[PDB]
Amino acid sequence: MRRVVVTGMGIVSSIGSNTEEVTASLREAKSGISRAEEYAELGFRCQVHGAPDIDIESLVDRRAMRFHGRGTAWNHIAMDQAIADAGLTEEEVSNERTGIIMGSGGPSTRTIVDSADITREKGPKRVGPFAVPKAMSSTASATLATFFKIKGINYSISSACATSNHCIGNAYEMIQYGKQDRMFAGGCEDLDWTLSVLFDAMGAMSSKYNDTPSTASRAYDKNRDGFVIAGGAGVLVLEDLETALARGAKIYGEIVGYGATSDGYDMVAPSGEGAIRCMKMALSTVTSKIDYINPHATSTPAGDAPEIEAIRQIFGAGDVCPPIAATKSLTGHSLGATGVQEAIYSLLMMQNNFICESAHIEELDPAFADMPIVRKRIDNVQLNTVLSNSFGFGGTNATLVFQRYQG
Amino acid sequence: MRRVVVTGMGIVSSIGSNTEEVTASLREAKSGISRAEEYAELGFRCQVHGAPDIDIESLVDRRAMRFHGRGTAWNHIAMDQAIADAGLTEEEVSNERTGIIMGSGGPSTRTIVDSADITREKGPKRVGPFAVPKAMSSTASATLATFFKIKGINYSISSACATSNHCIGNAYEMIQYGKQDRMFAGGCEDLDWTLSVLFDAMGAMSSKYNDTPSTASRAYDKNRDGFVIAGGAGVLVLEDLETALARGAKIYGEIVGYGATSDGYDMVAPSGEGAIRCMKMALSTVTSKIDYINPHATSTPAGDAPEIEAIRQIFGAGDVCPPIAATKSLTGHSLGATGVQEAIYSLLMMQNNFICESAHIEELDPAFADMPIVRKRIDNVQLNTVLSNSFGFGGTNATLVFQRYQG
Ligand SMILES: Cc1cccc2c(N)ccnc12
Ligand SMILES: Cc1cccc2c(N)ccnc12
Ligand SMILES: [Cl-]
Ligand SMILES: [Cl-]
Ligand code: NA
């Protein structure tokens, strides 16, 4: 099997509109969470969100927007960034050896609702002719494959909050097996009340910090009370190692492990044992120690703890366990975009020799007092191997391991 | 790479609620298309659909339905059928070597719309706590993986009308590469006005045959005027050959080729050249002649023709080209479910030594007069290798080739 490297990155996040902004937010523990006035107006319990701050119309032209919902428009921006970062020519983007696996946890719920409303108010014709590619689950792959003239693989994987970890992992497999030489991999999610209300209704989102929105997401805090929803996108350019070396690519890291398993247990709550099998699967092909864990940890009572137990089972407790820092405390949870964004955060930390604080821990949950949860940013540290978990509703687990390339 | 066989099938279709019913409809060219009174009431141009006729509550118990939209409920039925057909034990369904790749072209649009309506009329709490797993793009994999206690791979692929062909192909790869020994693969789609209107609004669906609904879908007819939308589901059980042989499995066929490519051209219209590359990819691993083509052909002016040209380019014209019969003329188009259902139709035709009529051709389009489009059912024919195309919006192409197992 061939070796596979990351040669370019792009991102739209609640903590920045490019990799430089995101790096600055990570370093300074600057929260991306703000008040969602619209949620309050509609009567939600949770009134916080992680909203990107980016001018779409300035970055994607009107005709290029015809088939984009907002999530996929953010994904288009991230794809332009990743192409520019990788320094790819048009021929390197558009060829039979180059594909795309790009997903979202849902399609444009906004498009679906607006369409139903306008059908009933003004008639079906007034939905307009461009709604299907926004509303279908493959929206992220379809829109980008068509616009960027992708000729190789083209489809979406979805797996809830695991979505873009599986997209990256499957794209890794395509290259390992020799089916493609370059892949664009990642995903996106719109941020819209028509999606967010589904989570508010299940009581899944934070509601006791509405008056201090910036600290509402607080993985590992004793008083965590649910996740904070976000939108955005991310893209990695992946290449077989020979392709990357021969063109003088930047190598942000090598993908050295991928795990994918299923709990077969509960729709919302993780089992823990599935996560253990997923991490062991990712680690089975890794020879070096892990220097940093980017957990799934979403700031929920029932979710943060089984993952910590799974980490304990594999790595042990205390100083022998890799440092753990939950980026969702700053970013919230962007569903389909989470996995790829967390890959990017981890690669940017590796590039810049620091591990961010696991933010907003005012009082550590005593269940986790034995674990190396990062309470203050760690500087001047050389990270060589990093592990990121994403887990999703339906007991779906994905883990990725990235390594600094040194030959 | 390991050999991979189909050991069980399940189906919910507009032309039958199990494989026996479906076989009878294929043999007798019995249309599954009927009047959609609701579409007429809402002011649609198209007033026809392909609706399954199946009593869900009699086949899936109430607690088991908690997280199902109607499409995934049909998918659950198809999964029960496929497990029963394969004769699998509980241990054979639930183990680390057994996974699920199960998709839909969209999630439950009904759930999304109902949720938005009830939020605005009665408040967010009244959405209830079970909406997310119905509304997310991974609904088919999440619900079934959780209920059937799947422990291996668990995710969805989506690619519009290519969805379940890619699900089967990726599951085939998992087994070929040795990552899993058994996979449940397929997909589903609900049938609901909140999805159908999106297609009516683009003018994509048949509207000139509303007074004769049974003949509205008519691939290759000179007067075809758009596709007819349908709902349903299908499931294949896939196994590595040694696993299948050792347990005395039924072998409905061996998967011997898979193609997946991208047009990189137009969002709605196929390019043709992408399809040629996809078929060549599927055929690159096939040594036998193709005895039957199950085309993508959806009964659209702009879609049926480029595929015919691509077939001509690969296979030639006239008698040297494999017989072509468009099952969508009977079934309509079930979006996420199409691929797997067409695999099942093709395997059932192979099992029963016949090729169905390509139905409702009152006047053949003269552009296709040189091609072996089946005008009357062909009996007493031994089919050994069959090819099925599914293509999707966003220029996404998938082709599967199945072969009668003879060693
Ligand atoms: C199995 C296991 C446990 C803890 C750490 C590991 C590592 N760093 C590489 C591979 N396997 C590992
Ligand atoms: C390339 C090509 C053209 C036509 C038929 C074929 C077949 N039956 C197997 C493999 N390749 C083929
Ligand atoms: Cl459950
Ligand atoms: Cl286009
Ligand atoms: Na309105």
Ligand code: NA
């Ligand atoms: Na992570």
Ligand code: NA
């Ligand atoms: Na109402």
Ligand code: NA
């Ligand atoms: Na087909």
